[PDB]
Amino acid sequence: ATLFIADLHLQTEEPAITAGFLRFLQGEARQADALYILGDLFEAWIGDDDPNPLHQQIASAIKAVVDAGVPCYFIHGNRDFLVGQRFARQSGMILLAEEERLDLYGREVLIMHGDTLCTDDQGYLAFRAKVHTPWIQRLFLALPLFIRHRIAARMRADSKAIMDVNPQAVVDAMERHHVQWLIHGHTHRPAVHELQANGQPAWRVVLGAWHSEGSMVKVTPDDVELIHFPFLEENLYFQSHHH
Numbered sequence: 435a436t437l438f439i440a441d442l443h444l445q446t447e448e449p450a451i452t453a454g455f456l457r458f459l460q461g462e463a464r465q466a467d468a469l470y471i472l473g474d475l476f477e478a479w480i481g482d483d484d485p486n487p488l489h490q491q492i493a494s495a496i497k498a499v500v501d502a503g504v505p506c507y508f509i510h511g512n513r514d515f516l517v518g519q520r521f522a523r524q525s526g527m528i529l530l531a532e533e534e535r536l537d538l539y540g541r542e543v544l545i546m547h548g549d550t551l552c553t554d555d556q557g558y559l560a561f562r563a564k565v566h567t568p569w570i571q572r573l574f575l576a577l578p579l580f581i582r583h584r585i586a587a588r589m590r591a592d593s594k595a596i597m598d599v600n601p602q603a604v605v606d607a608m609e610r611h612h613v614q615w616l617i618h619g620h621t622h623r624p625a626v627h628e629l630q631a632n633g634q635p636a637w638r639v640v641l642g643a644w645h646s647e648g649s650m651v652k653v654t655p656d657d658v659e660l661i662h663f664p665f666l667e668e669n670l671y672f673q674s675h676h677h
């Protein structure tokens with residue numbers, strides 16, 4: 435089986451999500467044929483030289499999955515688009531493009547983060563075009579770390595003071611790649627949408643964000659599974675209910 439996760443939005447202020455991800459990496463992920471992380475692994479990223487200890491803890495845990503024989507892949511999200519080759523080397527992850535076509539046990543599957551499908555949010559698309567401009571990225575990454583931190587903290591507060599996908603963009607993407615299956619995240623609306631692409635039925639599978647519990651897509655030769663699970667091992671106990 436091949437696993438897909440996304441939108442964990444890991445951050446030191448949310449240690450429960452981190453604990454749930456580490457348990458996932460130590461258990462479920464060790465049995466997979468491959469693990470794909472479709473963006474927004476971290477709530478924020480300002481460059482691979484960031485000494486944030488969470489980054490090294492996550493890198494080491496993913497690297498242990500890679501060392502256990504499970505190749506791990508990463509497509510950038512809108513939050514962590516600055517994840518680069520240094521962190522890829524530290525984690526053992528392979529960085530992929532914003533769109534990839536996979537062959538999963540015979541079925542062709544398109545994967546992406548999903549933010550490029552929200553073509554109706556012109557405000558976000560302007561921000562995305564800005565921070566994806568290569569000379570702007572190089573200029574920001576050259577700034578001192580403490581300056582990048584203050585910029586990011588202010589820009590996050592400015593944003594606090596998610597649009598769904600455009601149906602035709604979905605069709606266009608699935609017909610550009612000639613697939614009947616699409617997996618993405620970003621929208622935080624886990625679902626399986628049926629549609630038509632290339633004159634045949636097609637399905638758009640959406641991952642969930644790790645807010646209260648975990649979420650993953652498991653692809654087997656026989657089916658596609660959208661699975662919700664708790665962060666930690668909920669040890670069962672009994673309460674003496676009465677008839």
Ligand SMILES: CC(=O)N1CCc2cc(S(=O)(=O)N3CCN(c4cc(C(F)(F)F)cc(Cl)n4)CC3)ccc21
Binds near residue numbers: 561565566586590
């Ligand atoms: C919609 C959405 O995705 N948002 C909204 C706010 C936000 C904040 C983050 S951030 O905190 O992780 N971080 C902020 C600073 N940033 C910059 C800043 C610059 C510039 F300052 F020079 F312009 C250039 C570049 Cl290349 N990167 C890197 C990322 C991530 C995603 C989002």
Ligand SMILES: [Mn+2]
Binds near residue numbers: 441442443620621622
């Ligand atoms: Mn997200």
Ligand SMILES: [Mn+2]
Binds near residue numbers: 619620
């Ligand atoms: Mn996103």
